[model samples]
Target: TQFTRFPFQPFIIEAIKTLRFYKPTEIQERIIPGALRGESMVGQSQTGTGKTHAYLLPIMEKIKPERAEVQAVITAPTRELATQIYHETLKITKFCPKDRMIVARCLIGGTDKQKALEKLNVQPHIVIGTPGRINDFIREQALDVHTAHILVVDEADLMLDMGFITDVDQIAARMPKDLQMLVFSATIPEKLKPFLKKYMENPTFVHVL
Candidate 1:
């Protein structure tokens, strides 16, 4: 096996080893390193091509467990997908201590809204949820998007399909100007272009592939 190492905390590498991710397809090989470096990127690739981990692993490296603030925000199209991402994150964080665990919360609808409020009162390091719920939490001052360092849109085309782009736009609008943004989708529609263009403007432009 030809192995390429992800040089971060040893535990992160251990998590990868634990997950049995011993091989990197072309996309992971091309994208993971770039995303790891706090780069703003537009990732377009087919689903089930390991794109999820490509974004998730590197973003996890940015989690500041020392701080209770939301360090990373990831928006998925639906509740099920958000839950899936959240659980995948848990697998990686299994290496974290039980008491001082890396705080991550799944904030999709259908769960207790008030419960979410209770959780956000303390704030989690990573937040995964649907666009509307995340945007609403941001608008209601439940979750502070400004404190977060990274924001990920997992499926932009699907977000558009569900008419959640405006929700995402609202969330982005509230984010700090210097925040590192990540956009990944199977395809980018014409309508999503202007929103995507708003990020990666000027000197912040970085590279992959």
Candidate 2:
């Protein structure tokens, strides 16, 4: 059987082939198809399950390359995760149309604010950042997230553990109601249930344990 069977566009398939990913990892094999179907997903899997690609691939496929506005926003709990996501997304976007101008920007606390603002001015196709910097940009109106089509909260449990839930919720509430949400975490604690339930729409739960 083929690894990806979502009927993706030719370029996407060509990109996948060029990447030499002949087979999908367990999480990708299961989640990619459902994600392409536009189902809200909550994935629980350990590290190294290829969870990043599971979500990233579907997102790249749905992106409107013609739209010049920021379409996707991925929030990570730490600067490390934010940078990781930015690089990973860049790798997949290489297969997209050259004119599409797929780009990823990193926003994290402790960085030079002016530099971050300059990056935002370019209107990247995707923005991946930690909560503090993302909130900073939003407050300054440097980042208009209302137009974002996809919002991903990676490592939700870690953010909550670090007492960043309030910040996360504030940022999430600012996004469009119709935005597709993909939340991935090692474990969803009791405190996060209400927020997840209220924000996520009948989310499809996938656990690898």
Candidate 3:
């Protein structure tokens, strides 16, 4: 039997095969199923454990490529992480059908706001950026959060350490209440407890240690 022999759709199977993923990682094997089922999750995993793909793959599966809204929003603590996540998301979503026209865009500080606005005009399926840039775009009305379905907070601890919690909260409040919240962090300190309580609702905690 092939790896894609399960009940997954053809495109998802093709993505797995094309990426040469022989087997699911420990976290993937656990988190993917729940996420695909539309369950909000808080994933605690170390760096380099393929955590990004674990969250991204499920999001890709759920996105409606035909819709002209930001289906997914990923916020990273640093510019480097945001850029890396955007590239990885591109890789996964690239396998989508061309006619569906799925696209991923990056919004980070130090870039031309005009260019970012132009990209927003196209209404990308996925938007990945640092908290500051994302909040700025939202305030400028360049990015619409009312229709954003999936919201991911990557490296939540670092965002707190950098004093971006207020910005993150503002962004979250702007998004739809029905949005799926996915928090991925190496560590969750006591300071972030209030944030988790206010934003997340009965989120399933997945720890890969």
Candidate 4:
């Protein structure tokens, strides 16, 4: 009910309740409003700033599940982080209306090829995974990312440190040019700016301590 301040859908409201999130955190409050507007953003905040829901909530609200295409792609630096984000996504999508179900999949490394192929047979509405695995899927033409306009580069600082930003860059190039990039990092290193500038257009920068 408190989140009614933002124009979130009923299912998202219910999901908020289920998540027991009484209100938006500082970063959520700052980033969510712009995020819901489909504005590209660079959110500089710590891990517990509720930055996940700040982007996830808006992305879920904007997802067109009926399209049966990858509408949103969330890439994390590591498998565990990607898996954690995937699980969080499931919690919200679980409450989706029966008629309009949201299909999400986690594609990380170490999964057998057969399972990965099967997962790709039916395209997921939301794709969450590590950068390298996602890039592999895109390259093999198994994952159709051209239809996905929304992209969240989670833990971008870590992504750069791990040398996965190049993979992330390659993945972004495959998608539509007018991508809604939601980049989150504890600190935005200078090296990361060129990539951000290449894709994002005057992104709203929300730095929260």
* Candidate number of the best TM-score: 4
Return the TM-score for each candidate structure: 0.88, 0.91, 0.91, 0.95
lDDT for each residue of candidate 1 in 32-105, tens digit (9 for 90 to 100): 77777777887777655267787777877767778888888899999888988888898888877556578788
lDDT of 3 by residue, 49-108 (tens): 378878887888788887988888889888888889888776677677777757888888
True-structure RMSD for candidate 3: 2.3
| Residue 28 alpha-carbon offset, candidate 3, angstroms | 1.0
Winner on lDDT (1 vs 4): 4
The residue pairs in collision within model 2 are none
How would you encode candidate 2's per-residue C-alpha lDDT over 45-104 as one tens digit per residue? 775427887888888888787776778888888888888887777777777777775777
Q: Candidate 3's error at 101, in angstroms? A: 2.4
lDDT of each: 0.77, 0.79, 0.80, 0.89
For model 4, which pairs clash? Answer: none
Indicate which candidate wins on lDDT. 4
Model 4: worst 10 consecutive residues (lDDT sum): 110-119
Summed over model 1, clashes come to: 0
